[PDB]
Structures are given as structure tokens and as C-alpha cells.
Amino acid sequence: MEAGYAEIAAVQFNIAGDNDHKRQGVMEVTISNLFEGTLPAEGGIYDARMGTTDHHYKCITCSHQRKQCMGHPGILQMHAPVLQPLFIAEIRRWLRVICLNCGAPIVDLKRYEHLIRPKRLIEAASSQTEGKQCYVCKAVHPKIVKDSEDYFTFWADQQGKIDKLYPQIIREIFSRVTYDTVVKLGRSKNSHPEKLVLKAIQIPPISIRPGDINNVIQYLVRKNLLIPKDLQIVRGQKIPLNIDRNLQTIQQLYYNFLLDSVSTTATQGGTAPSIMRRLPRKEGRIRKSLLGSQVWSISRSTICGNSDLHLDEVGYPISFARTLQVAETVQHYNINRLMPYFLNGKRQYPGCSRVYKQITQSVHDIEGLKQDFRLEVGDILYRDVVTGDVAFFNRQPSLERSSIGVHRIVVLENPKISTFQMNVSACAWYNADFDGDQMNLWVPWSVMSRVEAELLCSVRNWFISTKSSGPVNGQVQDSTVGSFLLTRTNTPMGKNVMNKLHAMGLFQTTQTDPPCFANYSPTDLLDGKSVVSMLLRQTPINYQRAPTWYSEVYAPYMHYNKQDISTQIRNGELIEGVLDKKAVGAGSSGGIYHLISRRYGPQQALKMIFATQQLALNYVRNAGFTVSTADMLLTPEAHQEVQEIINELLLESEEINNRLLHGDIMPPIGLTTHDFYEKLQLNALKFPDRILKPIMNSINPETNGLFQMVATGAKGSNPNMIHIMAGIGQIEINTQRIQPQFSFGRTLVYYPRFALEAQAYGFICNSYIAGLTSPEFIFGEMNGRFDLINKALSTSSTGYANRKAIFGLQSCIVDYYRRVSIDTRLVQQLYGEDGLDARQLETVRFETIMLSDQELEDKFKYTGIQSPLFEEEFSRLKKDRDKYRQIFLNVENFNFSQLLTDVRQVPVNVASIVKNILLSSTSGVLPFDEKSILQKYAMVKTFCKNLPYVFINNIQERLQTPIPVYLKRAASLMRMLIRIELATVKTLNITCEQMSAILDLIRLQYTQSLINYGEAVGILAAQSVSEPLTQYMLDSHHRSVAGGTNKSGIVRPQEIFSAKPVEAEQSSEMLLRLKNPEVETNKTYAQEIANSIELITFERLILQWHLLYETYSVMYPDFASDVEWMTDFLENHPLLQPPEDIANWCIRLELNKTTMILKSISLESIINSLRAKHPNTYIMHSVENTASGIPIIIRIYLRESAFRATDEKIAVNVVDKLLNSTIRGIPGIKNANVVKLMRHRVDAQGKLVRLDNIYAIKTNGTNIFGAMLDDNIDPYTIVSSSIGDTMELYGIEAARQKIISEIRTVMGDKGPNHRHLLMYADLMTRTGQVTSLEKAGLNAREPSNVLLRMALSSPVQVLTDAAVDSAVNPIYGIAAPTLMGSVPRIGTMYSDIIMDEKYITENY
């Protein structure tokens, strides 16, 4: 007895033979009766020994009730054998490789004794082996035919002799196979073919067939009762007519019981949901019951705003608080507190509903406990939810790490409130809005869950984004506008001041301790900056940034106050500037709340957000804010100005049209006239910058609510205002105008065919306030429908990609070395290459990067002591700068537009620590002290040397044990930052004890920033990269959809994640640098090279071609006039006479003169690119003098050297080969433009200068080899968007860097942290090959993780292959433990807890 605690460590999959069924069966099904009255009939399929599903009886086998009984399998002894439905393909493979007479293998086992085990049998069965002679019994192997009428019948074809392979005969055949043959064919000894035939099937436990799937079982039992029990079928017995039909229907019944309505690739044959149909798809067993679950003790409601709630609070209706209960166990310390809940009971709130008495080991109703007076120790009380309880708040779809957060409950006692109320600043965590969104709320009742909710999942932990490493929450909408209105210097009423009474009223709802106004007279005037400083003095921070209010596009108009365009906060005091989206807005990196979180913790940041939001809202409570129709109304003069601007745009469009009409539009090389015309029209119809002048002439910026919302960043943008007031402009769909889809050349019924006006192609000349006409409204509806379609399918595409990425990355978990490993196989030597949490990073500028050799000496070379130590320190600084420059200039070289930056994300802002210590210092300008300065230098040097020990522990630091090289590299950036910010020049007014404190603070901050052991960093990366994907979809109508540049939708991300080959890429690009640094400046040379490497083939320049059976030294009549220019060619080319091997076959091609002119293709170029290309040929051209009307004709005469298959067919193949020859360019490059490149180079003074005058070729299509062959391109700086090309030519490391770069390009400016891209790239390249995020990548990376691959997709094939291969599935990661009903061993469960026996004995 006493079943001890255990955990499943591995799962073994095997084929279950009839012996296993007999061993595991608790009962034998023998009758067809279902129920004997109110009880199951004994021996039937419902027999209670199989388990109980009804309350009306117990099990018998385990003597448990329905809830505690897991069910037990039975046995049905089949009178005739049946084939295993899941392994029909295995039966077919085994039948074709072993002799059906003696069981010996007909194939040569030595032939396949070099393949891997999972492939030996497949290749053995691939060979024909029909008619092969056995070397043991000299029998002839028949043709194993799979019947096309069903999925299980096999036919033996002996040179036309047809006999049915019955399961009994198959078992006789399979029982003669030795285990030696099984092993030599790559199969496990548990995969002997004798298990593929079942004489005793297993009827599943009733637990999986509750009281249809039992109809099939009943029918199977009934049909099995018909077959005689002594039936003995041998090869060639001629079962007459009815045993045959009965056997076929029994086998079909079993096959439909197991595999009905599921196909699988391993299905051989043709023509009540089954067992295997329950598993797959969203509603299947795995995804619906194992990966997710329905739960109890949970609530859902609509969410609405409540500005009186803190960011970490949620408004809970009281009716829900008396439904969900918290389980508090009564002990000595809580009996007094819990007694009021017990006394209130179910009649008053806060009360309780149930009590679990320990003495009775059962739950007691509160209305039956009226005689208990008090509660006993060990009792469990289920009390109502009260204010201050923690709750899990969740909004679906749950895509971010903050999609589930823990809030403190605020119980709303108003009975008429049924919504989940929350602060509007908390919506950023969930991507929620108050327009109908519903959120799930469940209160943790168990002690462990409550501890975790208040310690691990509180929303204060999600204030900093795991994705972007920046703040998530901030002021939104009314709060941003209110902050601007409160902090602005002047109102339309004069100076922005309030009296003491209204200044006090601003702090009424801040929920903080109010500031002191006793030093203010009732008539004293306080500006908004003063009250903002009063609030922000509690968390003093330093801020200096231009506000969103100041925009350069607005500067020519308006009159910006000089005190409003430079926001400065010094030690919590707002000196100047306004507060808006840049400073207080949500998601504003570097904003005031981000700084507050960095210096005082995210809880302080949330409290400050609430306080400042209350301040702004209380200010607007008096200032007022509104938008009216007149806010969007231009003055008549401004309307005339807008009309004039649009008239100028349409006049430029009409000038382009006039150029087209006169045939003056000449497209460049690479574009057709239609494409060039469309590009010119798109450029001509863009609104100028001066469209804002009429708008701002009609707008009073100090009074305009719409302009104030747009300019302060609260809501809207400049295009919104322009569309509302001036005009929408050109409607662009996928970068192009409206296509003529109504008819041939017609965009709408309202416009004529081949209309040239811009209005016919989507140019909207009217503003929204002016109103749109019917065609303008139709074009706008097309654009809006595009937006709606993209929004709708963004959810689905993001779901697909997110699920694939999660299942590809979920097993990646940080271990105790802070490496990332799948089980035990490494993915990263250190997480994010720095071992840091994404929530603990700060962007910091490195001051030495851009300095020249002289400013570096003038700013960092300390000359106050004549010591070599400071020379060494400056040398160390210079070497750090040089290493940084080299690394991040190399990074520039293998990227398209990744510029070297002065700022880095670091765990510790050293300069801020030094500034804080100096500000708190009770000293200043210390006297010169050589000993102190040298001591501080020594301390800093030792701290830098011992910095990588924060990655190990204090013990190894004390022992000074060797540091691994990768850990030394992990601290390189922090060593650089410390040596810069703690340089001797910068630490002259810092004492030695102050230096010790600074170093201790740096060490503490570095330790606090490390990634936790057991973090599911793969899932974090999957979320952080899948979240920007829906925004990437939302701009799908702003991306090109044409061939060669197809970037619409998820085409590029699916290309990246699926590791699609080069030929499968639709937006391949390459970047080529000229192999001459001094001539990259010439745009003409760059254009020359770009047009030179553009791929031109013979087919591009052919109007038509005709192959002829005529030799030369007769002639198709339609071209008898060709002999004139033919003889002219003979006369003009004396050394090009026809050779004496001229054959009958010859092509005659007409050259397209228009294409030749447009592509600058000369006839001599063709003649030399075909003559010195083709060995067995004789080519002739007409006199190129041809004007319009007479054509250039190229007759290519073949030779029998080519003919050295049907002659005509090989001649046509030769024609195809000749046509595809490369006349000009490099293969695979459809287009090649010239782009201006921004690059950094170190000049002779050691300075890093940003150069804008670099020209490079941005090709369409990739060929790294071809681009590296030409000598006009720098071969060492070829950048191609193709991951496969980079992998094939450069290697797996360059492929990893390319994956990083391409994912970064897809994410865009608002992308995740670099460590998530590193996670994606390192998972995909861990095996030395670029594996995908699809099923194939999982198969390559985790073949043994059968459960994970079943959970991803295709459970039936994965299960079948696992059973056949006898796969052992170790339980690791998340999917495998979850499918086994266990919990993943990560997070809180990554490290186990044991009892400190010594301490417990010595401290009872």
C-alpha cells in the first residue's frame, strides 16, 4: 500500500500486440448485451470491470466511484485475425521484403547495411522483388497488390494467379520472420511484424466511451459472434461467399472504429467519430483538452474605464465577489481575522459560502454551521472576495507576456455595475479598449497561487515590455492632452496659473499624501509646472527632451513659445517645456515614467502614472477640452489655397499626360513605359509640405482641440488632419494606383476607357469635411475594405505564425549556467549573448565612439599625475573604442541599412549612478590627492577584471577561479561603459568610499538584471516576434504586391520562418558595393554598373522565332526574301563562311527593335554573346541598319555536333537552351537600381564620420556567386536578403546573422529586443543547418519529442511513426509534460525545494 509520489520522466511508444492486450485486459468481451436492467451486463462492452461512467454503480476493478476511476481496458478474442488499421503500410512493407513461404528475407540484408535504421525497411520495400527466387525454399515472390476498394485488403499476384491475403495468412507469413531479419531491416525487437495482426483486440475503457462510438463496438462484437471460432484459413482455401463478406465487414468495422474520416499519407487503398479522429485540429483532444482546458472559479465581463482606480487595480462587481471564493485555512494566526467572514456567512458581505472541516474531512454549508460559534484550527474557510485580494486579469487573444496580469481587487458595491473596471493606462498591457472587449478574471484561492500572483505575475512586473525593453504604460488620450494643457506656459486667457484653491483641487484624487500649500496665500498664483514639480519631487528624476508639441513641420506657422519647446526636469522639478506623449505617453522610451521605474521601481512608476493622470484630469476639469465641426473647417481663403495646391498637383499630372500623348515619356532601362508613367503619376500627386499652410492659417493652435490632440500625440497624426481638412489625395493600394478592373482600360463606370485624368485612378481631390463624390467614395471604400480585410486576416495569419513559433521555441529554457538548451542540447551559450533580462535594460550612449584621436585625449586622458597607470587607462579606453568601431562597422558591412549607433542597451546606467552619488554627496571639488586617485583607479580596474563573476557567484570570485571566455565576452560592453563613465577625469570629485559605493551599486544592478534560471525564453521570443507581425499585416496594403517584390501579407516572414529555398522567395534583394572606394561617389558609374549587371536573355529580345529543317552552303516560302540580307552577311563576313558540318535544323528569330532600343542592346552584343558562347552553331544576322518597317533577323544554323531521342525534340531542346542564354547581366537579377548608402568610415584623425554620398546597387533577385564573380563589385561586402543563398555560400553563422537581419527588417522600427531575434536565429541554426519553424524543423530539432510534435500538427502520423520506431520520449519542455497531465519543470518549478533537516531539528 501507500503509493508513493512519482513523476513521469519518459514515455515509450510501441505497437501493442495481442499479447499486450491479453496481459492488460481486465475482462473478456463475450456477449452483445449492453445493460442488464439498471446495471451493465457482465461480459458486455459496458461491463463495469472496464470502469464506471455512471453514478449508478462503482467500477469493480478498482472499487472506485465515477470520479476516481480512470477506466480499464478489456479484450475481445476475435474468431478471425484482423490487421492493425494504423500500421497497414507497415504490413505492406513487410509483405514485400520477406518470403511468404519460409519467412526469410527475399532482399539482400547486406545491401541496406549502410542506411539509417528508420529507412532500411522503406528502401527494401521500394525495390520491386516481384518474381525473386528465395534462396532457402526456392519459391517465387508474388506481386503484393493493395486492393483499391478498401484500406486493408492485400492481394497476392503470382503471374496472374490471384489469391486474397487474409489476416490469418498474413499472420502465418509474419510469424516466420526472425528477430534477426527485423533488426537487420532497421526495426526494433518490439516492432516485430507478428504484432501487426491481432487475434484479440482491445475494447477501450468506458471512460473514453461514455453513454456514438459504442455502436461500432457493439456491431463489431455482433459480427464477431457470427464467424466460426474454429475458422482456419490457409493460402488458397476459397472461402465461399459469406465468411468472406463477414471477414471484410469485421475488418472494415475495426478500421472505421480506429481511423474513420482520417486519411494520413501512410494510407494505402481507396474508397461515429473514430478514436484517431478525436485527436487532431482545434476542437480535437490534444488542442482542446490537453493544451487548453475549461476551468472552474473564473468570471468574464465587459470592461469599462475607471480613472479612479490605480493601474494595478481592477474593479470587481460585488455579485461576482460573492460567487468566487478564496480558500483560507483556519490556523491560530488567522482565526480572529477569519471569524467575521464566518459570522457573516451567506447573508452579509464580506462573508463565506463553504467550510471544509478537518475533523470530518468534508465540506460543510455555512447555513448548517449555526452552532459552531468559532472555527477550529485546520479548518478551511471559503470566504467572499474582498478589496485587496489579487486577481488574474486576462484578455484574449493572449499574445503578450502581459496579456495575463495580477491586479489588486477593488470590490464595487454598487449592485448595478456588472463590468470589470480598470484604469485606461492599464489597457496597454492587454491591448484592450472599452468598446465591447471582454476580459476573464479569476481570483487565486490556493495559497501557492496567491503567493505567486502577488510575487510574480503582478502587473508591476510588466511595466517594462519584455518585447521592446521599454515602458508599456503611460498617459493616454485625455491624460496626455491634460498634461500638455497643465504644463503649457500660456493659455488663451493669459499665463497658465491657478490660485491656491484650484492648485489644491488638483491633488484631491491623486491618492497620495497632498503637498503643503500653507506657504501660499489665497490670492497666490501657481503655474502648472509648480504643481507638476510638487508631484514629481517624490521621485526626483532628470529629463531633457523636446516635446511632441514642437514639430518642425509646424514651426513655419504658429508661434511656438520658447518655454514650451524644451522640456527639462531636474531632480523632479519641471523647469520648462510641456509634458506630452514624448515625456508622459504610453510606450515612450526614455520618458519620465521609464526613468522613475529605473530609479525607484515599476511600482513607483505606476503610482506616478496614476498621480499625474489625476493631476491632468483635474486640470481639464476646469480648463475644459472639446472638438467641434469648426475645428476642422478651413477659412475660404485657406480653401482657395488648398484648391490652388491641388490644381498645381493636377497640372503636373496633366503635364505628364501631355508628355505621354506626344510620345515624350522615355522609360529608363528596367521599366516599361506603363510602369514609368505610373511612377511619375504617383510622384506628381503627392501633397507638398506647404499643404499645412492653409490648415494652420485656419487653425488656432492654442484653441484648436483637433490640432492639440494631433500635435501633443494624444490621438491622430498630420495625415489625418490633412485628409479631414485639405484633401485625401491619391488612393494607393499596394503602392500602386487603382487598377482598371471594371473593364479593359476602365476603372469605374463613371470614367471613360483609357482615361488619363488622375481622378479616374483614385486621386481624391476633396477633403472629408468637404464631402466625397460617388467615385471618390467608391475609391475610399476600396481602400477601407482593404484595411478591413487586412485587419481581419492579420489575426489568422498571426495566429498561425505564433502557434508555429511557440511550438518551435517553447522547449528553449534558461538553465543554471544561464545557457538556453532544448532538454540538454545547447541553443545559446548564454541567453541573448549577455545573460540579461529584457525588462532590465536601459539605452545608454557611449561617449568615446565618435570622438577622434584628439578629442578622446582632450576628454579622457588624465594628466594630473605622472604615472604610467593613466597612460594604460587611456590606452584601454582607446582600444575599447577601436574594438567597438571594428565590430559595429563589420555589422554595417553585412546589413542593408543597419547603421552604427552611439547608444547601447545596458543593464546599468553608470553615469546616472555617479550623478546620484555626486548629488547626494556632502562635499564638492575635493582637494588633489594622488593616493586617492590611484586607489580609485585600482578599484575600478579590479572591478572590471572581476565583473564576469556576476555570472557565476561570490564564491568563485573569492576563489578567483578561471572565467570562461564567453563569460568574459559577456561583460565586455559593461566593462566598456564602466571604464568610460568611471574614468579618472570623470571621478575627480568622488571619494574612495564613494567609489566603493558606486561599484557596489553597479554590481547590485548587474545582478538584478540577469535572466532567471528556468525562464521560458523561447516562448518570450515567440511572443515578442509574433506581436509585431499583426502590425506588419496592418500595413499590407502599403507594401508592393508585384512579382519580384512581393512583400504583401506574411510572404516574407513565412519565407524566413519556413526556411524556403532561393527559388521560393518572391522578394529577393541584394546589395552590391563597388570594388573601388574612391569611385563609389560617382552616380553615373553606379548606374552604369547597375545596368550592366541587369540580366538580359535572348528570349527577352525575341519577337518570334521559327525553327527550320533547311541547311545552307532549302527555304521556307514565307522568308524567301531573307536570302538578300543572307548573301549580304556572307559578303560582309569573309571569315564567317558556313562550316562544312551544317545540318538541316536552324532557328530564324525576329529581334524586337523596341526592346533593343529601350535596353540599349546592340546586335553585335548578341552576335558575340552567342558566338563565343555556343560551340556547335552558325549564326547569321541581317544588316543592323534596319529602320522601322524592316526587321532584324537572326538565323542560327545548327550543326550535327549538337545532334552528336527524337531529332526534332532534341532540336527544340537546343532551341530552348539557346533562347535562355545570358546576353547581358548576371543570372537571377531581374532589376538593378542605384541607391544612396549611409556608411561610417574612420578618417585619418581617428574620427567616425557618417557618409551620405556612397552609391551602391540594390538588385532584384539574388546571386551571391554571380555578384562575387564580377570585378566591379566588392566581393567581401555582398548583402543578400536570401537566407538560403547566404547559408550555401557563407555558412551557418552568416546564415544566423542573416536570419537576425531579415527578421529585424520584417519587424521594422517598432521591433522586439535583439535577444528575441537571437533566440529565433539560434534555434533555427543549432544543428548546423537552417531548420524551419514548421513541422520539418521540429522533426529535425526534436525528433524524440513525440508528444510535442503530436501537439503541433499531424498527431496520427507522429503517433504511428513513434509506435513503429519504438520511440522513447523524454519528458521535458512544456508540451510533453502538459500532454501527460503534468506541469512543465520551469519557472517556479525549475528548482526543487527540500527541507533543511539540520535547521529544523536545531530550531524546531
- Point out which span in 543-551, 1164-1172, 1242-1250, 1331-1339 binds other proteins (CB under 8 A): 1331-1339
DSSP-assigned letter for residue 1321: H
Contact between 882 and Mg ion (CB under 5 A)?
A: no
By CB under 8 A, tell whether 15 contacts other proteins.
yes
Q: Where in 1227-1256 is the site for other proteins (CB under 8 A)?
A: none
| Residues 394-433, interacting with Mg ion (CB under 5 A) | 433
Would you give the DSSP letter of residue 1104?
Answer: E
Give the number of other Cβ atoms within 10 Å of residue 337's Cβ: 10
Write down the least CB distance from residue 205 to Zn ion, Å. Answer: 8
Q: Is 609 left (phi over 0), alpha (psi -120 to 50) or beta?
A: alpha
Smallest CA-to-CA distance from 602 within 720, 471, 496 is with 471
User: If binding is defined by CB under 8 A, does position 749 make contact with other proteins?
Assistant: yes
Give whichever of 1212 and 1292 is closer to other proteins, judged by the CB atom.
1292
Residues 39-78: x where in contact with Zn ion by CB under 5 A, - otherwise, as a string: ------------x-------x-xx------x---------
Q: Which is nearer to Zn ion, 135 or 1276 (CB)?
A: 135
Footprint (CB under 8 A) of other proteins, residues 911-930: none
CB 939 → other proteins: shortest distance, Å?
Answer: 22
Report the site for other proteins in 462-491 (rule: CB under 8 A): 476-479, 481-482
Q: Are 783 and 1037 in contact (CB under 8 A)?
A: yes
- Partner whose footprint covers residue 101, from Mg ion, Zn ion, other proteins, none (CB < 5 to 8 Å by kind): Zn ion
Whose Cβ is closer to other proteins: residue 620's or residue 926's?
Answer: 620
3 state SS of 880: helix
Part of the chain binding other proteins (CB under 8 A), chosen from 640-648, 1008-1016, 1029-1037, 1120-1128: 1008-1016
Residue 493 near other proteins by CB under 8 A:
no
Which region among 159-167, 663-671, 1006-1014, 1042-1050 touches other proteins (by CB under 8 A)?
1006-1014
Count CA within 13 A, CB hemisphere, residue 833. 15
- Provide the minimum distance between the beta carbon of 99 and Zn ion in the complex, in angstroms, as a whole number: 3
Whole-angstrom distance, CA of residue 1352 vs CA of residue 735: 37
Q: Smallest distance from the beta carbon of 33 to Zn ion, in angstroms?
A: 21
Q: Which helix (H) or strand (E) holds 1357?
A: helix 1355-1365
Tell me the CA end-to-end span of the chain in Å, nearest whole number. 31
Contacted by 920, from Zn ion, Mg ion, other proteins, none: CB < 5 to 8 Å by type: none
Binding-site size for Zn ion (CB under 5 A) equals 13
Residue 306, interface with other proteins (CB under 8 A)?
yes
Residue 781 identity (one-letter amino acid): E
Which string of DSSP letters, residue by residue, matches 51-113?
Answer: ---STTS--SSS---TTT------BEEEEEEEE-GGGHHHHHHHHTTB-TTT--BSS-GGGGT
Helix H segments across 1182-1313?
1200-1203, 1207-1219, 1264-1269, 1283-1289, 1292-1307
With CB under 8 A as the contact rule, the residue among 48, 165, 250, 279 that binds other proteins is: 279
CB closer to Zn ion out of 69 and 933? 69
Decide: helix, strand or coil at residue 275: coil
Among 14, 30, 77, 101, binds Zn ion (CB under 5 A): 101
Phi and psi, residue 880, nearest 5°: -60, -45
Exactly one of 312, 847, 1302, 1322 binds other proteins (CB under 8 A); which one? Answer: 1322
Helix, strand, or coil (residue 708): helix
Q: Check residue 637 for interaction with other proteins (CB under 8 A).
A: no
Given Zn ion, other proteins, Mg ion, none, residue 1392, with its beta carbon under 5 to 8 Å by kind, binds other proteins
Closest CA to 352 of 362, 363, 410: 363
In angstroms, the CA 639 to CA 355 distance is: 75
Q: Is 1217 in the site for other proteins (CB under 8 A)?
A: no
* DSSP bridge partners of 362: 357
Entry field: residues in the chain: 1404
Q: Residue 1144 to residues 1106, 1112, 1214: CA-CA distances in angstroms?
A: 13, 8, 14
Residue with smaller CB distance to other proteins, 651 or 1004 = 1004
What residue 136 binds from other proteins, Zn ion, Mg ion, none (CB within 5 to 8 A, per partner kind)? Zn ion
Q: Footprint of other proteins on residues 819-858 (CB under 8 A)?
A: 819, 821, 824-827, 829-830, 832-834, 836
Site residues (CB under 5 A) for Mg ion, limited to 796-815: none
Angstrom CA distances, 921 to 571, 924, 1199, 1294, stand at 14, 7, 95, 50
Binding mask 347-386 for Mg ion (x = CB under 5 A): ----------------------------------------
Query: Is 976 a residue that touches other proteins (CB under 8 A)?
Result: yes
Q: What are phi and psi of 69, to 5 degrees?
A: -100, 120
Task: State yes or no: residue 208 binds Zn ion (CB under 5 A).
Answer: no
Query: What are the distances in angstroms from CA 1285 to CA 639, 829, 983, 1230, 1269?
Result: 55, 26, 46, 17, 15
Site for Mg ion in 954-993 (CB under 5 A): none
CA distances for 546 relative to 557, 595, 608, angstroms: 18, 16, 21
- Choose, by CB under 5 A, the member of 308, 437, 857, 902 that binds Mg ion: 437
Interface with other proteins (CB under 8 A), residue from 230, 435, 1252, 1309: 435
Q: Which does 183 bind (CB under 5 to 8 A by kind): Zn ion, Mg ion, other proteins, none?
A: other proteins
Minimum CB distance to other proteins, residue 401 (Å):
5
| C-alpha R_g of the chain | 40
Q: Closest Cα partner for 554 from 689, 713, 644?
A: 689
Backbone torsions φ then ψ of 654, nearest 5 degrees: -70, -35
Stretch of residues binding other proteins (CB under 8 A), selected from 157-165, 419-427, 681-689, 1144-1152 = 419-427
| Residues between 322 and 381 with contacts to other proteins, criterion CB under 8 A | 329, 331-334, 336-337, 377-378
Torsion of CA 406, 410, 411, 412, to 10 degrees: -120
Q: Does 733 bind other proteins (CB under 8 A)?
A: no
Residue 248 sits in the site that holds other proteins (CB under 8 A): no
* Close Cβ partners of 454 (under 8 Å, ≥ 6 residues apart): 390, 406
How many residues of this chain bind other proteins (CB under 8 A)?
Answer: 334
Strands 313-317, 404-412: parallel, antiparallel or unpaired by DSSP? parallel
Q: Which residue has the cell 507469413?
A: 173
1390 binds other proteins (CB under 8 A): yes
Q: Which residue is associated with the grid cell 480535437?
A: 284
Exactly one of 283, 435, 552, 1063 binds Mg ion (CB under 5 A); that residue is 435
Q: Which of residues 159, 271, 519, 626 is near other proteins by CB under 8 A?
A: 626
Binding residue for Zn ion (CB under 5 A) from 10, 39, 136, 501?
A: 136
* Residue with smaller CB distance to Mg ion, 28 or 437: 437
When asked if residue 177 is in the footprint of other proteins (CB under 8 A), the reply is no
Which one-letter amino acid corresponds to residue 1106? Answer: H
Nearer to Zn ion, 139 or 417 (CB): 139
By CB under 8 A, which span of 46-54, 519-527, 980-988, 1053-1061 interacts with other proteins?
A: 46-54
**Residues of the chain with a following break (C to N over 2.5 Å):** 211, 271, 1113, 1204
Of the pair 13, 484, the CB lying nearest Zn ion is at 13
Q: Which residues bind Zn ion (CB under 5 A)?
A: 51, 59, 61-62, 69, 99, 101-102, 104, 134, 136-137, 139
Residues that bind Mg ion in the complex, under the rule CB under 5 A: 433, 435, 437
